[PDB]
Design an enzyme around this catalytic site. Structure first.
Site, PDB file in Angstrom:
ATOM      1  N   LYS A  80     -76.168 -49.880 -59.698  1.00 33.42           N
ATOM      2  CA  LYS A  80     -76.020 -49.078 -58.481  1.00 33.42           C
ATOM      3  C   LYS A  80     -75.180 -47.826 -58.759  1.00 33.42           C
ATOM      4  O   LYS A  80     -74.167 -47.872 -59.486  1.00 33.42           O
ATOM      5  CB  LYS A  80     -75.400 -49.944 -57.403  1.00 33.42           C
ATOM      6  CG  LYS A  80     -75.417 -49.385 -55.997  1.00 33.42           C
ATOM      7  CD  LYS A  80     -74.960 -50.477 -55.027  1.00 33.42           C
ATOM      8  CE  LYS A  80     -75.064 -50.043 -53.570  1.00 33.42           C
ATOM      9  NZ  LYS A  80     -74.415 -51.014 -52.631  1.00 33.42           N
ATOM     10  N   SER A 116     -77.347 -52.281 -49.070  1.00 36.02           N
ATOM     11  CA  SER A 116     -77.402 -50.952 -49.712  1.00 36.02           C
ATOM     12  C   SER A 116     -77.781 -50.945 -51.197  1.00 36.02           C
ATOM     13  O   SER A 116     -78.101 -49.846 -51.707  1.00 36.02           O
ATOM     14  CB  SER A 116     -76.105 -50.204 -49.521  1.00 36.02           C
ATOM     15  OG  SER A 116     -75.013 -51.007 -49.935  1.00 36.02           O
ATOM     16  N   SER A 143     -74.795 -56.461 -49.100  1.00 35.70           N
ATOM     17  CA  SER A 143     -75.641 -55.344 -49.584  1.00 35.70           C
ATOM     18  C   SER A 143     -76.388 -55.779 -50.892  1.00 35.70           C
ATOM     19  O   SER A 143     -76.584 -55.041 -51.915  1.00 35.70           O
ATOM     20  CB  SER A 143     -74.806 -54.135 -49.846  1.00 35.70           C
ATOM     21  OG  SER A 143     -74.827 -53.505 -48.607  1.00 35.70           O
TER      22      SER A 143
END
Ligand SMILES: [Ca+2]
Ligand SMILES: [Ca+2]
EC number: 3.5.1.131
Lengths: 66, 457, 66, 457
Positions: free
Chosen positions: B74, B150, B174
């Site tokens: 990420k 996310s 997330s």
């Protein structure tokens, strides 16, 4: 913030949180608030980056002994 | 190729790290124009790290436990020489990172090979990876549907077969949400287990980091590699390493396993309940258990998240609100304007909540819930219905995850494939007491051995 | 707690902290805020004594070993 | 006669504990009409505890270290069978406390004899003990002047000779200020040393509890008696007892002692500076040292105090605002309305601040400052002037105390008697690193031996 901005904020915020203020009391509250606003401005003079963390971070349970 | 095959194939000399790296690179090249999981490809670095592994093997060295395993992260994770985007355009003028994130350093030391950085909802505030600046990341099982978020790139890259391992963050869901929606494995460890140093934060009080993977072995191997104290990391409270890999196949005999009801059934749709039901049957779980104050747990997490996240970004919200993600900027601003009383009551309630969850786990080893209310909706969805009740789509994806991360309990998200659901996956959360990641992993392994939890092409 | 009270609070609070808000943005912020206000009300229903403390309390320095 | 003589008289059999108790009761009866330090007299209890000491002595037992010593406590401390007022009218209808405060339990176990509860500014929010509901507590050295606050009764009771030991609380100065203004001894221990359980709180993040006394020996003896872990107390970090009494007379040879400048001189009047100067000379301190970010330290403490204190009382501010103290209710309300960004920035700044203060004390053992900017002003004073700057009297009394408690450093407030000053006392803070209470006490003892720090008995 200006004296007018402080007045509008004290009125709206006090209504929002459920402590309605009569005119003399609103003026007294704004007087204390204005003094605190200066102290708060002083806080902003110390640089913090996003990784500058809170003084204390959550602990979900003690780490187990062994 | 799956994690364990890649590792053993490299170790035994049947395939090189470099060749495994070129396959991942080529797969990204052929698939990512549509999937849009990657925001940066560290091609030169990946080839150098892979070659370095092949050299060590050629020298006769004992290879480390993730030798030659490709992965990606990420884009809130610092990568040396790369500007850390955290899903934003605002960060693009910041200097490149001086060092890798500590977790990236540890994966590298374990022999893993970095392929690059992955798309996310801006500044982590979201559950769908519908990024206005960078485009949506698309669900590889149906590219008109969301990957979740996310950590959407982290889930999608694994489901597309680009990499076998990725790193994400989980504050209110997330990691678990994109694992659920993409049909891959996820681990959110205990709050304070894994070092957060060298990452772009969201909520100091609740952020967690951890892996997603193509298998439960991949979770365990990456988790063990990342484990260890970091005295320079303010949020870390792990004082030693507690290896999960040696006991991964120990089974669940004698453990007390329960199924969460109340909140966790009312906010679960038909597919979510069917997934829990089959996972419960396979794990020998039949008693329904009530989680304490689940709805209030969510509320307190929601309150603390908005104020801490929003205030973290105050200077930019003051001068350039129009350069933030339009889907979340007004949520950050709402957070800044929340009364301080809300924040303090939430922090005081968290103490009570912590006491109740720890007390609950004196009677249980593992508790089971669905990871998401439904499987992935269409990109652009604003409202969903769950058992006839409306919820806004974007916050609602975390209804089942948000209470559990607030107590900091470790969770494995196991991928399952329920019927009459358009062939789409949904995940199951296997939740344990703080520090009991290895019980979560032990349970996931039994689900995998039986074929209940798995990936699909 | 009314719609007009929420709107006046969003406007005054945003000016106080230095976030300029156009009318359409203030309306969007109020929409999110109103949803959060309900969650906050739910939180208020939980009994807390004055001695029910914050989850994390300050530590001035580690306690010295011996 | 002081603490040490009282204890010795009982121990040696020259006087009974009961007689010592009756004397204190008589003195309170004859003086408190005017001084107004006590809000309740636990007459029956005090007589029973004193008799119990006389019985143990008659049985041949080794008496405990505070055997028969009278004391009293700020009325935010729970006293079994008494309703804890914390300076309010609001609390009058709450049930009586089921048990003593932990610190009261420990004084009792040490043989001390409880005489009752003491006046304070309502809910601890103040520095002057000008209580509208209960009346002002009056300075025994000049009854038209304030005793300081919020532990005014704790200071005044000792200066009037009613009791030799009292307990107070200190968040931003509320032990140190009344010690300074009444000319008695005070100790604010390290944040997290002494258990807060069974007390009515103000600011969870900053409240400290501790003794005031007629001598530095009284501080040390009471402190050692109260020391120890309390796992049921969320704020306690002290894992063992570190006795101060056995080293109280060890002296200061070889210690690095400095005088604070900057903030601590600019907000000190002529008498305050003279007191610091003579204490510095006597302790061999000559280097002027700057405290890091002292003014900002005060600001952050001030911010966190107002929001935490105010929000703690939100339900009552909603339904019965008129029953609060009119001198502070509007300050509590201002606190509730403070933006959440102020609170979070103050909490983030506190991390930086803690790092800087702990780093400062790697180079110093003791640092010296005045306790108050001036000696006690007249009751009813609205404004004071310090070196040509006007301040509101009530907040300003803590200018010099507020930065130091925010870092949690232990402080002894030593009472001195400067010459240009209408015969009124002013105190000096002897400040040390976290956990170094015995250095503070060692320094106070040198001040006492030389006649510089004393009571006017
Ligand atoms: Ca969120
Ligand atoms: Ca105060």
């Amino acid at each position: 913030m200006t004296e007018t901005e402080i007045f509008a904020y004290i009125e709206a915020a006090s209504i929002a949180i459920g402590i309605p203020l009569e005119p003399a009391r609103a003026r007294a509250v704004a007087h204390h608030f204005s003094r605190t606003a200066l102290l708060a401005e002083m806080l902003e003079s110390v640089p913090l980056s996003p990784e500058s963390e809170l003084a204390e971070i959550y602990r979900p349970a003690p780490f187990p002994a062994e | 190729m799956k994690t364990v095959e890649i590792i053993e194939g490299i170790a035994s000399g049947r395939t090189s790290a470099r060749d495994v790296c070129e396959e991942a690179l080529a797969t990204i090249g052929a698939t990512d124009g549509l999937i849009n999981a990657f925001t940066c490809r560290t091609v030169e670095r990946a080839r150098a790290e892979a070659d370095a592994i092949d050299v060590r093997r050629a020298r006769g060295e004992v290879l480390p436990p993730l030798a030659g395993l490709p992965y990606a992260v990420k884009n809130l994770f610092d990568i040396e020489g790369v500007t850390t985007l955290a899903g934003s355009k605002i960060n693009r003028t910041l200097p490149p990172a001086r060092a890798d994130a500590v977790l990236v350093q540890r994966l590298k030391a374990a022999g893993a090979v970095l392929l690059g950085g992955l798309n996310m909802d801006e500044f982590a505030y979201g559950f769908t990876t519908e990024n206005t600046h960078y485009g949506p990341t698309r669900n590889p099982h149906d590219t008109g549907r969301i990957a979740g978020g996310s950590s959407g790139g982290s889930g999608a890259a694994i489901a597309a077969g680009q990499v076998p391992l990725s790193l994400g963050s989980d504050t209110n869901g997330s990691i678990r949400v994109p694992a659920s929606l993409c049909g891959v494995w996820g681990l959110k460890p205990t709050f304070g287990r894994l070092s957060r140093r060298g990452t772009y934060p969201f909520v100091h009080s609740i952020d967690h980091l951890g892996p997603l993977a193509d298998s439960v072995e991949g979770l365990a191997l990456a988790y063990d590699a990342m484990q260890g104290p970091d005295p320079l990391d303010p949020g870390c409270s792990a004082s030693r390493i507690q290896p999960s890999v040696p006991v991964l196949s120990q089974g669940i005999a004698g453990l007390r396993i329960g199924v969460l009801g109340g909140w966790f059934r009312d906010n679960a749709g038909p597919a979510a309940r069917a997934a829990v039901d089959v996972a419960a049957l396979t794990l020998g779980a039949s008693e329904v258990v009530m989680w304490p104050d689940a709805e209030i747990g969510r509320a307190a997490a929601f309150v603390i998240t908005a104020s801490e996240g929003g205030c973290l970004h105050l200077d930019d919200l003051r001068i350039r609100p129009q350069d933030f993600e339009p889907l979340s900027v007004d949520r950050f601003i709402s957070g800044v304007l929340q009364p301080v009383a809300w924040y303090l009551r939430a922090q005081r309630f968290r103490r009570v909540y912590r006491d109740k969850v720890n007390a609950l786990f004196r009677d249980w080893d593992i508790l089971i819930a669905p990871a998401t209310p439904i499987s992935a909706p269409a990109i652009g969805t604003e409202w969903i219905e769950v058992n006839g009740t409306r919820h806004p789509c974007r916050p609602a994806m975390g209804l089942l995850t948000q209470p559990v991360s607030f107590a900091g309990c470790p969770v494995v998200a196991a991928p399952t494939w329920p019927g009459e659901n358009d062939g789409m996956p949904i995940g199951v959360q296997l939740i344990a007491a703080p520090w009991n990641e290895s019980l979560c992993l032990r349970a996931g392994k039994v689900l995998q051995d039986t074929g209940i939890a798995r990936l699909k092409c």
